[PDB]
PDB file of C-alpha atoms in Angstrom:
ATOM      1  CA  UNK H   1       0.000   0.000   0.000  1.00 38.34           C
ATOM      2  CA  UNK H   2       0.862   3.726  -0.664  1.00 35.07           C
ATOM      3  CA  UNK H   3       3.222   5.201   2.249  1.00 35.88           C
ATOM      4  CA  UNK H   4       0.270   7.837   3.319  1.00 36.06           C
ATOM      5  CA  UNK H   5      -1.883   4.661   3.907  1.00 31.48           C
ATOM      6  CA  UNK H   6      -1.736   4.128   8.027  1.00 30.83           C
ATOM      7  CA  UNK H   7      -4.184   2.025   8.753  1.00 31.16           C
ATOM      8  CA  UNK H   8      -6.304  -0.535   6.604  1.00 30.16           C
ATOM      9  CA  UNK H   9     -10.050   0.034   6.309  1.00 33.24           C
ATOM     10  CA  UNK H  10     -12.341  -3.150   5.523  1.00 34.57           C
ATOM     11  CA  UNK H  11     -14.318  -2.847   2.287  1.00 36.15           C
ATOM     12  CA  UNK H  12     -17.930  -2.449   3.676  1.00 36.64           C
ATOM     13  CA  UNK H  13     -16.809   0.013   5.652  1.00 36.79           C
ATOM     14  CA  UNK H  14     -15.319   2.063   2.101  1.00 38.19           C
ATOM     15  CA  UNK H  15     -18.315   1.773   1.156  1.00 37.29           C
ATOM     16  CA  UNK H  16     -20.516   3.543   4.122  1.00 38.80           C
ATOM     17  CA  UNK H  17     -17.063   6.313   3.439  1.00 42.21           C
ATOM     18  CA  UNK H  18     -18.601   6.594  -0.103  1.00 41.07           C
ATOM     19  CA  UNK H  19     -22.021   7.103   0.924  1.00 40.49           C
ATOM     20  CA  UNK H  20     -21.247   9.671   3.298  1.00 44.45           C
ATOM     21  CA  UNK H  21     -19.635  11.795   0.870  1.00 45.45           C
ATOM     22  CA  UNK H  22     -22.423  11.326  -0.960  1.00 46.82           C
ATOM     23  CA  UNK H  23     -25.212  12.199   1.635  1.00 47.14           C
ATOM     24  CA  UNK H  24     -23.018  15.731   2.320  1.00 46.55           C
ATOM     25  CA  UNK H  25     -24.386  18.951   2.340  1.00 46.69           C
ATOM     26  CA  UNK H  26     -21.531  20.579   2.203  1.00 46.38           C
ATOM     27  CA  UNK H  27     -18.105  18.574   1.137  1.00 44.56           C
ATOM     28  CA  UNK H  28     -14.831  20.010   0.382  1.00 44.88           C
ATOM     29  CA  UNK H  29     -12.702  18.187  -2.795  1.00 46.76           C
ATOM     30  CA  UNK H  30      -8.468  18.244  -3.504  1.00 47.83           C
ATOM     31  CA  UNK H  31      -5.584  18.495  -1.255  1.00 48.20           C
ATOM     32  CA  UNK H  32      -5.980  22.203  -1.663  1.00 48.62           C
ATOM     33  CA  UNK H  33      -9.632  22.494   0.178  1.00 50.11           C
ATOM     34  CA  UNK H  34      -9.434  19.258   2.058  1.00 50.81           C
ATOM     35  CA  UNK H  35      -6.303  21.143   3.842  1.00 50.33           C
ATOM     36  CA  UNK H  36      -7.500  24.129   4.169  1.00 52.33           C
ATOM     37  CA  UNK H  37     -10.779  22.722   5.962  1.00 50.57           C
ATOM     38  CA  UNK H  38      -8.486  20.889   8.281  1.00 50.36           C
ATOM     39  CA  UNK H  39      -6.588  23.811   9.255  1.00 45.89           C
ATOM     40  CA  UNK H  40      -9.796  25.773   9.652  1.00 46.80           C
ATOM     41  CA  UNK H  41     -10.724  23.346  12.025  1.00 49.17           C
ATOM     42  CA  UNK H  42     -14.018  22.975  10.248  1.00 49.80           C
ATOM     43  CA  UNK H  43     -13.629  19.139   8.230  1.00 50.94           C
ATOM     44  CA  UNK H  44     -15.974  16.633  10.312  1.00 47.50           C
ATOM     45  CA  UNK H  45     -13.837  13.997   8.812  1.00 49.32           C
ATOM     46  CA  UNK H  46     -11.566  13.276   6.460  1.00 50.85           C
ATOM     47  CA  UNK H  47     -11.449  10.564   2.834  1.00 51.03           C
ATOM     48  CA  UNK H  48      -8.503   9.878   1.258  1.00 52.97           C
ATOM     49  CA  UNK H  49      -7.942   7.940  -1.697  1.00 50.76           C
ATOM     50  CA  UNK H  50      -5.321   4.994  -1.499  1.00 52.27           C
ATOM     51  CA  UNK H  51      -4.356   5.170  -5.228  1.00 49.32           C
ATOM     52  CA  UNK H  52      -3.036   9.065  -5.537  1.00 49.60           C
ATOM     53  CA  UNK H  53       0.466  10.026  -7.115  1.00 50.43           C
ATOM     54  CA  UNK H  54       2.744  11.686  -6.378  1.00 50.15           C
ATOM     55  CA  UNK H  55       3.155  11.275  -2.729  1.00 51.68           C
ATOM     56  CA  UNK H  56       3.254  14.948  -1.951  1.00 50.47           C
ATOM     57  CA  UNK H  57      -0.578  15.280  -2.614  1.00 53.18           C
ATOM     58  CA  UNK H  58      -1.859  13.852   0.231  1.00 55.24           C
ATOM     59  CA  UNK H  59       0.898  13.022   2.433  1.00 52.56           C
ATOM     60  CA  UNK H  60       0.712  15.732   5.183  1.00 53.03           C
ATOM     61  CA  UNK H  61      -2.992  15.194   5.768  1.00 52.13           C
ATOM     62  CA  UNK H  62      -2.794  11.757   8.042  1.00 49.59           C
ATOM     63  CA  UNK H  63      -0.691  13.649  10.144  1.00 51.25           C
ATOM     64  CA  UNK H  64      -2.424  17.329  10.639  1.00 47.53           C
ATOM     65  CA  UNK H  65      -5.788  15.342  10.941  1.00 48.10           C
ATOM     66  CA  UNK H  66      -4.478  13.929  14.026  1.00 46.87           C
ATOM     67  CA  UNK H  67      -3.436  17.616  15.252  1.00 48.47           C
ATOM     68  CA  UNK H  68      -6.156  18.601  14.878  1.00 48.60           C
ATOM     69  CA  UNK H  69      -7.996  16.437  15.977  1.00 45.90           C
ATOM     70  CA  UNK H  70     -10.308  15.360  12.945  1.00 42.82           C
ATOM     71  CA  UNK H  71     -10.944  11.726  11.901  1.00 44.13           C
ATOM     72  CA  UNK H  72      -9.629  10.541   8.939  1.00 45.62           C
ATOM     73  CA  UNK H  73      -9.747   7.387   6.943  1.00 46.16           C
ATOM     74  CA  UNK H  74      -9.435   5.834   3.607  1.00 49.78           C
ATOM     75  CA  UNK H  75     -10.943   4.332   0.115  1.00 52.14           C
ATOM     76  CA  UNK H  76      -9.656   2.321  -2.235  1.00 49.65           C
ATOM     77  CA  UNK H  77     -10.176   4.460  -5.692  1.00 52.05           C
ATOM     78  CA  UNK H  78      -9.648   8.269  -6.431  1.00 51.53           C
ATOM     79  CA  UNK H  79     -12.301   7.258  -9.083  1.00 52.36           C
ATOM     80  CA  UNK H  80     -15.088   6.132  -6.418  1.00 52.23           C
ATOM     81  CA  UNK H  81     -14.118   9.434  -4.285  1.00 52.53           C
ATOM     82  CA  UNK H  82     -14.773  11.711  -7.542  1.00 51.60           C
ATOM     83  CA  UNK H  83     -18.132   9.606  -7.973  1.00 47.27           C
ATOM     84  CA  UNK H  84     -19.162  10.732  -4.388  1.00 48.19           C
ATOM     85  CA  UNK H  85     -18.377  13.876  -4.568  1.00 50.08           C
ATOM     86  CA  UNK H  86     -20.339  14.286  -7.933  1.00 51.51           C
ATOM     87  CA  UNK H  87     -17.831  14.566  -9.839  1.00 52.61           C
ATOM     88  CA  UNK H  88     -17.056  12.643 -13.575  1.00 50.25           C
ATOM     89  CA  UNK H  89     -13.003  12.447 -12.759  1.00 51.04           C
ATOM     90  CA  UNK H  90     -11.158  11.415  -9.723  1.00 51.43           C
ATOM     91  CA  UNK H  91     -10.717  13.137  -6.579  1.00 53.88           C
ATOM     92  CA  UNK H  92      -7.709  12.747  -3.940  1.00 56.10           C
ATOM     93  CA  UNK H  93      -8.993  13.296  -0.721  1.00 56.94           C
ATOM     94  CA  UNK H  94     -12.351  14.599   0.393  1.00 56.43           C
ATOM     95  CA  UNK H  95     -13.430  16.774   3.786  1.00 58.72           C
ATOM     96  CA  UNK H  96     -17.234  16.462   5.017  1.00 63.05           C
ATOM     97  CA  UNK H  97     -18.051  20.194   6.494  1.00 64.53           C
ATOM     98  CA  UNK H  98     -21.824  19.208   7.044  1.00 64.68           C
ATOM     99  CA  UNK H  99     -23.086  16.107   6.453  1.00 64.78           C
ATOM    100  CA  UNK H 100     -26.133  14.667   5.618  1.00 65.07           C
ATOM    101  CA  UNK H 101     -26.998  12.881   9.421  1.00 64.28           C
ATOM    102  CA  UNK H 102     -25.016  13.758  12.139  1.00 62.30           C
ATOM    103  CA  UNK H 103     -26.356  10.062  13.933  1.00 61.15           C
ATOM    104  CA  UNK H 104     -24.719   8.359  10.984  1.00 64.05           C
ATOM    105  CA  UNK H 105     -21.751  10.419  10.923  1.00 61.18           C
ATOM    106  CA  UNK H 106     -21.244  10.007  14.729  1.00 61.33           C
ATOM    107  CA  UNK H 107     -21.047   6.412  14.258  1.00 61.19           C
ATOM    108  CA  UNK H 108     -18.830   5.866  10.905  1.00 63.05           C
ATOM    109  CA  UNK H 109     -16.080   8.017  12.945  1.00 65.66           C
ATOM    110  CA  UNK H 110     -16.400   5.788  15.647  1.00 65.30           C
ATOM    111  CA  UNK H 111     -15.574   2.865  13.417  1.00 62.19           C
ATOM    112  CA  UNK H 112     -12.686   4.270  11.924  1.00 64.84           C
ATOM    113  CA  UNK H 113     -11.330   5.339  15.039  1.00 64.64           C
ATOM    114  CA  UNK H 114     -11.614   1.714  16.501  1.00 65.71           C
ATOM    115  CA  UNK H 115      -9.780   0.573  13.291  1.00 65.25           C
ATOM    116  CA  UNK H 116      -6.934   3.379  13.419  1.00 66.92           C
ATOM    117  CA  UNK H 117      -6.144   2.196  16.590  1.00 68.63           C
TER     118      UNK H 117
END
């Protein structure tokens, strides 16, 4: 796996990433936003695509997540992440600023908190 990858995440649980991304109100898309939504202290959590080159895209966001304090985790395909997001292309990483049910939300971090660590 890519060096940025820290942890693995199960399939099924890739999928519920997706469909979060996909139930957003608001989302954030690209290193750029995703970083800047970090910093702002505002991302509710954090996707990141396991298949992104070069390394220097996403690198730095496994480790300011955990400064800050946000919950990150992974999927498999930039092309699946684009899909969520609406777009037609792929997408790097991905930041959920509202989401679409804050129950549901609540209990996807949990899960990829008890699989970080």
């Amino acid at each position: 796996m890519a060096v940025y990858v820290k942890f693995k995440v199960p399939e099924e649980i890739q999928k519920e990433l997706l469909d979060a991304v996909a139930k957003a109100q608001q989302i954030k898309k690209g290193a750029n936003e995703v970083t800047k939504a970090v910093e702002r202290g505002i991302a509710k959590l954090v996707i990141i695509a396991e298949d992104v080159k070069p390394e220097e895209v996403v690198a730095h966001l496994p480790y300011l997540c955990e400064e800050k304090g946000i919950p990150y985790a992974y999927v498999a395909s930039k092309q699946d992440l684009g899909k969520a997001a609406g777009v037609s292309r792929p997408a790097s990483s991905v930041a959920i600023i509202n989401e679409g049910d804050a129950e549901e939300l609540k209990v996807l971090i949990e899960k990829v908190n008890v699989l970080k660590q």
